[PDB]
Amino acid sequence: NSLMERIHEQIKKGELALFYLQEQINHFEEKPTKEMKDKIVAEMDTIIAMIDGVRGVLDRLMQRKDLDIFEQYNLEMAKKSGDILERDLKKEEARVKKIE
Amino acid sequence: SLMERIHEQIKKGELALFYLQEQINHFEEKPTKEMKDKIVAEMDTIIAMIDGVRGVLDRLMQRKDLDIFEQYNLEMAKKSGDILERDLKKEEARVKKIEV
Amino acid sequence: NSLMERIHEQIKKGELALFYLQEQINHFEEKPTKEMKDKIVAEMDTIIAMIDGVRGVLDRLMQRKDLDIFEQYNLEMAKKSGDILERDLKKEEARVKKIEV
Amino acid sequence: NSLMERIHEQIKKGELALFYLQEQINHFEEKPTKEMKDKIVAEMDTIIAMIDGVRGVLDRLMQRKDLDIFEQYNLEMAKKSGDILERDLKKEEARVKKIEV
Amino acid sequence: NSLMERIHEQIKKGELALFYLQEQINHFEEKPTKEMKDKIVAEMDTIIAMIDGVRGVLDRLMQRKDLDIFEQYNLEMAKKSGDILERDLKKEEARVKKIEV
Amino acid sequence: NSLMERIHEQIKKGELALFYLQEQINHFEEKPTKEMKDKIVAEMDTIIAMIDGVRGVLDRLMQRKDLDIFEQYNLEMAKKSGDILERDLKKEEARVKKIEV
């Protein structure tokens, strides 16, 4: 386990939070409102803010000597995942701003 | 797609946690200074990631354009967040308090 | 909290579910889609079927002859509030069904 | 809306009703009497019975198709948290009966 | 309504308190305990305090010049009701206190 | 026994006092007059003054130390119902005054 299941449920929320953001964008495109843009953009800057600090924490943990071939892999995957997401966010966010 | 990749990446994050658990299980068998140092170092990183997300929630829970449903969903995520982080912190202390 | 803490938030969810329904109806009047009509109605019938079930349970408890005046009061209020909510639901569901779509 | 304003007030009343039950259990432990246990158990069996009526409600919805991602997830948690809540209730009730008088 | 029905409810609240009080005293007489006595005395003191406060308001109102025969009578009755209630409450309070625990 | 009965009828008086007022306002519209207007004004004024005074008393009571959640809630509701009532009174009176007489 339950100790692990707890974390999983918490992570699943973040995933659904992205789906929701995607829905907000969809609703925005339909009926564009400056008020909604302010919301979406802020939220996107929020997610990016977290990833920024998170990446740092990872870069530090990877500079250890204990990490084995398996542990090293996981960290590299998490670091890359954050990169992929943050890139696809700033790219998407920039598009929203371009929407008149 | 992106969401298809986010889900795939998230699944890997789960498998990573199950591995950490097995190294804790292995540590209960042969409590050593080396493994303990690694585990603790990894538990710190995880807790930090949560503590970080915790700070992101607060920044959002201050806006005005938040309907009752969004506010509630966040308050729940934060309440649950503090619970999970509190459970992990107590779990780490139990690890840092073991002899060889 | 203990059980009361959980029971409380559990009831809080019910309150939100209502406001959520209000939104379904509020937006339904904007674009009367029969696809949503069949959906909303189903939800209302579910809640009503739940209330009707709760009443039967409240009636059995009120049958006891060892409840203090305050306990009797709370049971009457609970049953009454349920009776009120069901009135407004059936009167609203009837109006919704009238909207062609 | 006055209705939701009244429902909200009723929730506050029901909240006090639950806390009042808490006190009953407290004093019950202090001075364990048979007659009190009977009423407390009956009151909890009622609270549990209501939850059983909630599950049959959720299940009926969790089978529906026109539910989206968010709606389906919200109910799924309500059912899980509901099961745990009810489970904890039955456990709390057992502890009460165990207190012989 | 959403007003007169709400008022109707808040009115019955006063009677509920008194009825509940009479039950507390009854239960106390059956099983006297310092905990309950102190609780009953505290409640009565508060209720009495409310009567004393209200009496002041009623007296100030009687001074009004634009009062007709009706409004004036209603005040006298409301004033006498408090006089009776407080007179009986104090007698019951003195009696309860004298009960050995 | 005669006390509770007296308090009960003392309750229905305050209830009728508002309905009787509502009827006064009704007939007034049918045939406006500077006399009924001055009377109604004084009537609605006195009631408002009462609510004001009672609130002040309710504020003092809440400052007591031996109060419990149930006593605090009763006071809160008593003060709340006083606000709503007076609110409609102040508004309604305005509508009454702005009537061509």
Task: Give C23-48 as a DSSP string.
Answer: HHHHHHTTS--HHHHHHHHHHHHHHH
List of chain F residues whose C-beta atoms are within 8 Å of the C-beta of residue E13: 74, 77-78
C79, C60 in Cβ contact below 8 A? no
User: Any idea which residue has 């061509």 for tokens?
Assistant: F100
Q: Which of D26, B86, D31 is nearest to C2 (CA)?
A: D26
Residues of C in contact with D47 (CB under 8 A): 7
Long-range contacts of the stretch C79-84 (C-beta < 8 A, 24+): C79/C55, C81/D6, C81/D7, C81/D10, C82/C51, C82/C54, C82/C55, C82/C58, C83/C55, C84/D3, C84/D6
Give how far D27 is from chain C: nearest CA, Å. Answer: 15
- Tokens 């209020």 sit at which residue? C77
Q: What is the rounded CA–CA span in Å between residue C82 and residue E42?
A: 35
Neighbours of A54 (CB within 10 A): 19
Q: Is A39 close to B63, i.e. CB distance below 8 A?
A: yes
Q: What are the chain E neighbours of D3 within 8 Å (beta carbons)?
A: 2
Cβ atoms of E9 and E78 within 8 Å: the answer is no
Please give the interface size between C and E, counted as residue pairs whose CB atoms are below 8 Å apart: 9
Beta strands per DSSP E along chain F: none
SS3 content of chain B, % helix, strand, coil (to 5): 85, 0, 15
| CB of F23 closer than 8 Å to CB of E4 | no
By residue count, chain B amounts to 100
Give dist(CA B46, CA B50) in Å, integer: 7
For D95, the 3-state DSSP assignment is helix
Method of structure determination: X-ray
Q: For residues A50 and B74, is the Cβ–Cβ distance under 8 A?
A: no
Residue with tokens 């106390």: E28
* Cβ-count burial E26-42 (b if 16+ within 10 Å, e if not): eebeeeeeeebbeebeb
Residue B47 · residue B85 · CB < 8 Å? yes
| Residue F23 to residue F2: CA distance in whole angstroms | 31
Q: Where are the alpha helices (DSSP H) in D31-98?
A: 34-61, 69-98
The answer to whether residues F20 and E24 touch, using CB atoms and an 8 Å cutoff, is no
D10 at E interface, C-beta within 8 A? no
Q: Chain E to chain F, count of Cβ pairs less than 8 Å apart? A: 87
Chain E neighbors (3+ CB pairs < 8 Å): C, D, F
Which domains does chain F carry?
10-101 (1.20.58.970)
E runs forming strands in E9-100: none
3-state DSSP helix/strand/coil % of chain A, to nearest 5: 85, 0, 15
> Comparing C-alpha atoms, which of D3, C74, F10, D18 is closest to residue E6?
D3
Please give the Cα distance from F31 to F28 (Å, whole number).
5
Cβ–Cβ < 8 Å for E87, E42:
no
Residue B59 in tokens:
């920044």
Residues recorded for chain F: 101
Chain C neighbours among D 70-89 (CB < 8 Å)? Answer: 78, 81-82, 84-85, 88-89
Residue D98 forms contact with F (CB below 8 Å): no
The data reach a resolution, in angstroms, of 2.8
